From a paper:
Class IA PI3Ks signal downstream of tyrosine kinases, G protein-coupled receptors and small GTPases to regulate cell metabolism, growth, proliferation and migration. They consist of a p110α, β or δ catalytic subunit and a p85 regulatory subunit (further referred to as [name]α, [name]β and [name]δ), with a broad tissue distribution (p110α, p110β) or enriched in leukocytes (p110δ). [name]α phosphorylates PIP2 in the plasma membrane to PtdIns(3,4,5)P3 (or PIP3), which can be converted by 5-phosphatases to PtdIns(3,4)P2. Here we report on the discovery of UCL-TRO-1938 (further referred to as 1938), a small molecule activator of the [name]α isoform, a critical effector of growth factor signalling.
We next used a deletion variant of p110α (p110α AA105-1048)30 in which the p85 adaptor-binding domain (AA1-104) and a C-terminal membrane binding motif in the kinase domain (AA1049-1068) were deleted. Co-crystallisation with 1938 did not yield crystals, however, soaking preformed crystals with 1938 revealed density for 1938. The acetylated indoline of 1938 sits in a pocket comprised of L1006, F1016 and I459, and makes face-to-edge interactions with F1016. Two orientations for the indoline group of 1938 fit the density equally well (yellow and magenta sticks in Extended Data Fig. 2f), and both orientations have an internal H-bond between the oxygen of the acetylated indoline and the NH group connecting the indoline to the pyridine. 1938 induced global conformational shifts in the p110α crystal structure, with the C2 and helical domains moving away from the kinase domain, the AA1002-1016 kinase/activator interface moving away from the helical domain and the α-helix AA1016-1026 moving toward the active site. Activation loop residues K942 and R949 are important for recognizing PIP232, suggesting that a component of the mechanism of action of 1938 is to cause repositioning of the activation loop to facilitate productive phosphotransfer to PIP2. In addition, 1938 binding causes pivoting of the helical domain to bring the ATP-binding loop and the N-lobe of the kinase domain towards the ATP-binding pocket.
Residue numbers in the entry: 107 to 309, 322 to 504, 517 to 864, 872 to 939, 955 to 1047
């Protein structure tokens, strides 16, 4: 068909990988995933056509609302008697004139009641009685929608107006909302039909695992493509282990050593486990190792290549017969000989070290037992032997179980406690937050001990998403656990929180055993029913496509997404093209013209930016940082190479929106090629979570988690904060330690003075507690910035996990000379003390978020010691008073 071939290449352009290359893969799991995932695409497309045209606009322009309509009390007090002033704009088609209309309404009106008060005010002197304020008001509030002035963000749903993020921040930032009436038909007329078509690539005995009573053995035949130095390497062998999510189910078993010239073994390795006792997520982890002989020094075993296999395939079949596994290059850092956390499957580069294996064939297909059999074997032998009144808990015992629940992902559960948790597993359903710890108590190489945990999980009470995510990290491989976790996310995870957590959730996809699973079908369905989520879903996947360990998985997931995302694929292709130009341009500035004057680089830049193909690709597309922002014409006179390390580009676009003057008229984005911005995305994620934790508890410590998006390999975008300056720029205007204070006095004269100091004090207090916990390094005068209104914020988070200068406390003390002894300083301290204890209450959240990214390859997130720094700064090994004591110490150390 013709219309399928044009879509195949547009999907390929967006992914960067030809779709035909996916037709050439013969792995039945790959072709079954490609075919079976389309059920999520039809479910999503069907959802978009339910209440069309509204449901279709809901997909393209979903409500950008907070997780809850409830307002913190100090935010409601910012309102007048619970009401908000709102300016509503109407465009009068003759002259396209902008008529304004200022309203005052309850913060909890839904959009259509705000539309009502707008027309009652548009005709407020039009001689209309009560019998005429129902002919025009009742008809128009069904024909109009509210749009944010200056961007493509709409209020298409009956949420409380103040629950919309744009309105929530206007309430908190003291600004006034500017909205605009739009005819429903004006918006609906701009939504295509998105006719999703099913692609053309759609359309003997079995025995139980538990009857195959016999020990496990695996044959290691030979290895090809093993290129080593014959002059120094002595022998070669295959190291092997059976692992369940990074934990060994039995002792590792090497092969015999052979000369590095003849890598053949023809050996059956036997393992200390029984085949019925293999868990569902059982994995074979092997690697080829060299041995070098040294006089006086011990032999050194260096791994040469690694690989992991699933003992069961995606159809629950215990694997039998011969197979060839292509292995992977050794990660710089892996100091063991096996890589159990590495992805599973044969390296797609088939010209790499290849290991041939063989599994036993037990006369027929062997499959894992279904829940029916598991239940029967669980209810049976649950009390094979059976002091039943002693396992009854006492107040001391129950509490201990709760104390174990408070522990973070990195805590160690002693063997004493693991047998405690397991024996009292029938009580644990009363405290569902113990489930992560109770799951680690299982001896997963025991089908009886596992069949019973499957039974407690089948009817386990749901838990909060922040804890359900813990069960999705790589140390919980079992599909029953991960299905429970995903079910908890489907029921309790709002869209707002999903968006904030999407980085970790896409990252953890790479640890999943199989292509088709409940997490990927959850994430895909939400990406295909909410285009704002689908947009970042796309870029978190695309930006990782260069990693060969995941590029096949993410390439297939992107294929299914691009087939069903609708007309947005064209917009994404415009963003992909625009970014490739910037990637190819800044790569020249980093290779060829790297040592030339900025004069020479700019001339090359202006000249290249003036070519026809370039101006077409980089004008008239959506900002990857926020697709609600349209990037129109590129105002080249304001573009410049900056004076930072990687020579980032300062790019300036006109905002083509009609109301641009009410939000921002020029959109400025920093394109940076050279630094892993995933590392900065994670920091700004945390800073945003710390702000929400503080607001919901009464601390208006205003942070600035500015936008930041990784689009590829050490390439990405950074939102420019407007009306802000670094301390370098402030101090150079007039150095003295009172230049900062004097600069804010000039910018905040009169009544605004005390507001600027308060804003600077609350924002400064937020950033001292955050930068201390997170260990932000390299804190010099260009990394801290101040806004004209006094808001302080940091800006370079390329260093974390291993700062109160004088002229900061001068601003807090309102210019006093004994800054360490003023009362204004006493409030600064108590804000920090309260802010520290609020974060410490959520240590599990912030530790989980790092732990899930530990395998992502971030330069400064390489080991548990990096994460343990937060276990130290948060003082999780002490009491609250002893922890607040700790924080007080470095506060006194900080000048
Ligand atoms: C102290 C142990 N205790 C503490 C709790 N614990 C635990 C295990 C795993 C994870 N999560 C994880 C871990 C991931 N990698 C790794 C897992 C295990 C070791 C290392 C990993 N490294 C990298 C670079 O890859 C560094 C070395 C990737 C994604 N997620 C979280 C906690 C095990 C028992």
């Amino acid at each position: 068909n013709r219309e399928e071939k044009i879509l195949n290449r547009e999907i390929g352009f967006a992914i960067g990988m030809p779709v035909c290359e996916f037709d050439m893969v013969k792995d039945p799991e790959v072709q079954d995933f490609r075919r079976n995932i389309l059920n999520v695409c039809k479910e999503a497309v069907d959802l978009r056509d339910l209440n069309s045209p509204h449901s279709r606009a809901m997909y393209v322009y979903p409500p950008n609302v907070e997780s809850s309509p409830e307002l913190p009390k100090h935010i409601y007090n910012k309102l007048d008697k619970g009401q908000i002033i709102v300016v509503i704009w109407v465009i009068v088609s003759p002259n396209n004139d902008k008529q304004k209309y200022t309203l005052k309404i309850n913060h909890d009106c839904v959009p259509e009641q705000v539309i009502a008060e707008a027309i009652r005010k548009k005709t407020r002197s039009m001689l209309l009685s009560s019998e005429q304020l129902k002919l025009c008001v009742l008809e128009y509030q069904g024909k109009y929608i509210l749009k944010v002035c200056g961007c493509d963000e709409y209020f298409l749903e009956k949420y409380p107006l103040s629950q919309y993020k744009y309105i929530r921040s206007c309430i908190m930032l003291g600004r006034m909302p500017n909205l605009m009436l739009m005819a429903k038909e004006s918006l609906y007329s701009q939504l295509p039909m998105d006719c999703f078509t099913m692609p053309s690539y759609s359309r003997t005995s079995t025995k139980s695992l538990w009857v195959i009573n016999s020990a496990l053995r695996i044959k290691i035949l030979c290895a090809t493509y093993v290129n080593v130095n014959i002059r120094d390497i002595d022998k070669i062998y295959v190291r092997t282990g059976i692992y369940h999510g990074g934990e060994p189910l039995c002792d590792n078993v090497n092969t015999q050593r052979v000369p590095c010239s003849n890598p053949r073994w023809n050996e059956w390795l036997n393992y200390d486990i029984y085949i019925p006792d293999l868990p569902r997520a059982a994995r074979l982890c092997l690697s080829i190792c060299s041995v070098k002989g040294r006089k006086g020094a011990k032999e050194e075993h260096c791994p040469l290549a690694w690989g992991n296999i699933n003992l069961f395939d995606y159809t629950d079949t215990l694997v039998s017969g011969k197979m060839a596994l292509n292995l992977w290059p050794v990660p710089h850092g892996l100091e063991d000989l096996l890589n159990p956390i590495g992805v599973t499957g044969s390296n797609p580069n088939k010209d790499t070290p290849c290991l041939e294996l063989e599994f036993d064939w037990f006369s027929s297909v062997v499959k894992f037992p279904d829940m029916s059999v598991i239940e029967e074997h669980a209810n049976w032998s649950v009390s094979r032997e059976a002091l039943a009144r002693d396992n009854e808990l006492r107040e001391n015992d129950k509490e201990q179980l709760k104390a174990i629940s408070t522990r973070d992902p990195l805590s160690e559960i002693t063997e004493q406690e693991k047998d405690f948790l397991w024996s009292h597993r029938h009580y644990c359903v009363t405290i569902p937050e113990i489930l992560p710890k109770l799951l680690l108590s299982v001896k997963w190489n025991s089908r009886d001990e596992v069949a019973q945990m499957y039974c407690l999980v089948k009817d386990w009470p749901p838990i909060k998403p922040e804890q359900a995510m813990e069960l999705l990290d790589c140390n919980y491989p079992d599909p029953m656990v991960r299905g429970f976790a995903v079910r908890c996310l489907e029921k309790y995870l709002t869209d707002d929180k999903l968006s904030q957590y999407l980085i970790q959730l896409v990252q953890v996809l790479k640890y999943e055993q199989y292509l088709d699973n409940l997490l990927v079908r959850f994430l895909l369905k939400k990406a295909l029913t909410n285009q704002r989520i689908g947009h970042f879903f796309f870029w978190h996947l695309k930006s990782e496509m260069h990693n060969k360990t995941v590029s096949q998985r993410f390439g297939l997931l992107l294929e299914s997404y691009c087939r069903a995302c609708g007309m947005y694929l064209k917009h994404l292709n415009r963003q992909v093209e625009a970014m490739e130009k910037l990637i190819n341009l800044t790569d020249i500035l980093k290779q060829e013209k790297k040592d030339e004057t900025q004069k020479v680089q700019m001339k090359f830049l202006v000249e290249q930016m003036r070519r026809p193909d370039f101006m077409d690709a980089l004008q008239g597309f959506l900002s990857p940082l926020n697709p609600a922002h349209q990037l129109g014409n590129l105002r080249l006179e304001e573009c410049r190479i900056m004076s930072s390390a990687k020579r980032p580009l300062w790019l300036n676009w006109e905002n083509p929106d009609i109301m641009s003057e009410l939000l921002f008229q020029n959109n400025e984005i920093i394109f940076k090629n050279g630094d892993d911005l995933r590392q900065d995305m994670l920091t700004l994620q945390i800073i945003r979570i710390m702000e929400n934790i503080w607001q919901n508890q009464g601390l208006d410590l205003r942070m600035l988690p500015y936008g930041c998006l990784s689009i590829g390999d050490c390439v990405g975008l950074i939102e420019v904060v407007r009306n802000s300056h670094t301390i370098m720029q402030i101090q150079c205007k007039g150095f003295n330690s009172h230049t900062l204070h004097q600069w804010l006095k000039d910018k905040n004269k009169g009544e605004i003075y005390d507001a600027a100091i308060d804003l600077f004090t609350r924002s400064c207090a937020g950033y001292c507690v955050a930068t201390f916990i997170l260990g932000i390094g390299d804190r010099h005068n260009s990394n801290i910035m101040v806004k004209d209104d006094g808001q302080l914020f940091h800006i370079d988070f390329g260093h974390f996990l291993d700062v109160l200068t004088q002229d900061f406390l001068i601003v807090i003390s309102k210019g006093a000379q004994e800054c360490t002894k003023t009362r204004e300083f006493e409030r600064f301290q108590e804000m920090c003390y309260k802010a520290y204890l609020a974060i410490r209450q959520h240590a599990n959240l912030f530790i989980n978020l790092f732990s899930m990214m530990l395998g992502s390859g971030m330069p400064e997130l390489q080991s548990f010691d990096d994460i343990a720094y937060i276990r130290k700064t948060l003082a999780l090994d002490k009491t609250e008073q002893e922890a607040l004591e700790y924080f007080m110490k470095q506060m006194n150390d900080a000048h």
